[PDB]
Design a protein around this ligand. Structure first.
Ligand SMILES: [Ca+2]
Ligand SMILES: [Zn+2]
Length: 391
């Protein structure tokens, strides 16, 4: 054990806190409690809960406050640009040890990988636009926009759309994306057509002033959100998920030299000989197989620059986008050679598991989910702080 840094878990465009969904864990799902497994095995682990539909920016600012403590500061420039609130939620802070000198391992799934990368980028370099807007308007500035923070020892991404996902290119993506949200609710044994008085799934849309109202089901609430700024704006997950939006993110969110990066690619498809398309394997979650996989595995776009390397997928995200950011990115990606390197993406390999199977939300008995994360946890613990040249 070369380091003692705690592990922090980060969801994507779906995800909730440990107390949400009647205890049903995002990290573990039907398989159990991943955070508990790691803690029980001697790996200190925590779980972050941010806005699933929110932008990676807004998610980064939420994560920062959720880590060190305080009220979420979205930045005056950003808030003015997108028309949402500058200040959001207040958090007690999961790890006050960060401000006294500590580090963390961030393990991220799906869109979470974008959020971790951005969080690292803002912590290290801040936002120049935020700093200049502050001096020019005489408004205050969050420390997150100053740079100089070294909170993150490593970032691991699992099934992450670093170059985006072609899923957003479906003609009925708006209806199907929220059908996916209802599918995840279903997996937690939560009905989507029921007006729960208890809030089960908090989307944390405080900055937009959006929330589920009394007498309103998730079906009705989703219909509102589609017409809401968290779906029709660019300050959204919807945009960051897209190939053009992800490329834009890559152009300013770069790999820190002081931080280790690991990527895990997922796949759950087979190649059709005559078409060259990719089709959902036996076992893939019912939703992705029926609705999403056929599009992901057959859709091509010359203009957008999508050829047949993008067709292999895990039901939600294209596998070609997973090893690390490439579209509009200067980051390097190397295949794992037994040694883990700093400031570069370590391609840990491709795993035959779908997008929801890998976090246990969808079942897969042939997949030892407990071993996967325990093996990952010891790898992060083995990470040397300092490195030094040798033959
Ligand atoms: Ca399955
Ligand atoms: Zn925003």
């Amino acid at each position: 054990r070369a380091n003692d840094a705690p592990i922090v878990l980060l969801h994507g465009f779906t995800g909730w806190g440990r107390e949400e969904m009647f205890g049903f864990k995002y990290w573990g799902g039907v398989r159990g409690d991943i955070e508990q497994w790691l803690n029980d095995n001697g790996y200190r682990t925590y779980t972050l809960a941010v806005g699933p539909l929110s932008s990676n920016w807004d998610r980064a600012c939420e994560a920062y406050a959720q880590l060190v403590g305080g009220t979420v500061d979205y930045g005056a420039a950003h808030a003015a640009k997108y028309g949402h609130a500058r200040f959001g939620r207040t958090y007690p802070g999961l790890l006050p040890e960060l401000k006294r000198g500590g580090r963390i391992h961030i393990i991220a799934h799906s869109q979470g990988g974008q959020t971790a990368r951005m969080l690292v980028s803002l912590l290290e370099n801040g936002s120049q636009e935020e700093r200049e807007y502050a001096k020019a308007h005489n408004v205050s500035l969050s420390p997150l926009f100053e740079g100089g923070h070294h909170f993150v020892l490593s970032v691991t991404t699992i099934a992450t759309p670093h170059d985006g996902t072609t899923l957003v290119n479906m003609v009925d993506f708006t209806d199907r994306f929220f059908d996916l949200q209802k599918a995840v609710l279903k997996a937690a044994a939560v009905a989507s057509n029921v007006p729960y008085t208890s809030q089960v799934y908090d989307f944390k849309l405080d900055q937009w002033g959006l929330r589920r109202q009394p007498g309103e089901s998730f079906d009705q609430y989703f219909e509102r959100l589609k017409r809401s700024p968290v779906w029709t704006s660019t300050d959204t997950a919807r945009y960051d998920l897209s190939v053009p939006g992800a490329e834009k993110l890559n152009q300013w969110v770069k790999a820190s030299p002081n931080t280790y990066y690991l990527s895990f690619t997922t796949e759950r498809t087979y190649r059709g000989a005559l078409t060259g398309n990719y089709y959902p394997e036996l076992g893939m979650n019912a939703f992705s197989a029926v609705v999403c996989a056929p599009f992901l595995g057959s859709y091509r776009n010359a203009t957008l620059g999508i050829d047949d390397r993008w067709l292999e997928n895990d039901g939600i995200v294209n596998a070609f986008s997973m090893n690390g950011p490439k579209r509009g990115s200067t980051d390097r990606i190397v295949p794992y050679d037994g040694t883990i390197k700093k400031g570069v993406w370590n391609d840990m390999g491709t795993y035959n598991v779908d997008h929801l199977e890998v976090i246990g939300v969808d079942p897969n008995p042939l997949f030892d989910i407990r071993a996967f994360y325990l093996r990952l946890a010891e790898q992060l613990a083995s990470l040397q702080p300092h490195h030094h040249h040798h033959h």
